Amino acid sequence: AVPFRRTSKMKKRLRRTHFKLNVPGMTECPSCGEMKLSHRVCKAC
Amino acid sequence: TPMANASTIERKWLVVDAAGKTLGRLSSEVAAILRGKHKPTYTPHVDTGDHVIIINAEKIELTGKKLTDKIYYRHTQHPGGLKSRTALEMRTNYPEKMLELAIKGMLPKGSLGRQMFKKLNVYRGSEHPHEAQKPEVYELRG
Amino acid sequence: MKLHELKPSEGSRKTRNRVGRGIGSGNGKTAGKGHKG
């Protein structure tokens, strides 16, 4: 259970390809123009 | 100054009838045709061959007792998973694969060899669907 | 003899041999002493 060798840059970058975030689901508030998460609340919107 | 060929390649279609022929003697000439060794513009890295259609694949001949004692093996991947069948079964049920195995084994290994093999068509019977390519008739030299 | 054109007598001065300064000089790794001897 000991790393036999260091990890190259290219393999590290390849492994980090699924490690990213998603754009949120946002809708605009009927009254106002604020943006909130869909199915979330904003009467103050 | 020697001319290497690229995008100037023009291929033809040839029909070879394997009725009274030996497996190895036909396959050598066919593989040489596929690799393009019969053309003055042959270059070793651009696949200047041409297409070959082989008909009557079930009529091929094997000398000696090869029809009984030549075994075709294959190991799938499982340890000790080696299955086999004799050349009689191969010619009676899967002629096309039997010709393809030889011609493939006589071709160079790598990407270019696999492309060259892609240029080959084998048919049991006497008819082929490639009349639109207007192929010619090629006679084996030896 | 001017002070900017000093010339030694030919053959009176020889350059010292510096040992252990690369394999291209012939006296590199083992420094001319060879192996254990």
Partner: protein
């Protein structure tokens, strides 16, 4: 007096790192592996400057064989006939050009055929 030295070391290592331009990953970045790769490249370049002369003759022979069998001869018979006629001065390289650019060179094959009888 004392001598420090940094400039000569930096320049000598930078020359090697610049020669290692285009290699993969660490082999164009770190001096120790770039030096090894440059030495290997020197050896390979010598060996392949010999193998190139080896290989182009092989290509020429292949093309001559093809164009000669397009006439009813083989390479060996055609070369023997050509040498037997003194016209063999003509090379293999020049023959091969006169096979992709002027197959009317068959004239030479006709001469060899005539001499082979």
């Amino acid at each position: 007096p004392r001598v420090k030295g940094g400039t000569v070391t930096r320049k000598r290592r930078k020359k090697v790192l610049k020669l290692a331009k285009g290699y993969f990953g660490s082999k164009h970045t770190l001096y120790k592996v770039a030096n090894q790769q440059v030495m290997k490249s020197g050896n390979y370049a010598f060996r392949d400057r010999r193998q190139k002369k080896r290989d182009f003759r092989k290509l020429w022979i292949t093309r001559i064989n093809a164009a000669a069998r397009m006439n009813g001869l083989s390479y060996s018979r055609l070369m023997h006939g050509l040498k037997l006629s003194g016209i063999e001065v003509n090379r293999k390289m020049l023959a091969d050009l006169a096979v992709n650019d002027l197959t009317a060179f068959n004239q030479l094959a006709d001469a060899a055929k005539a001499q082979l009888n």
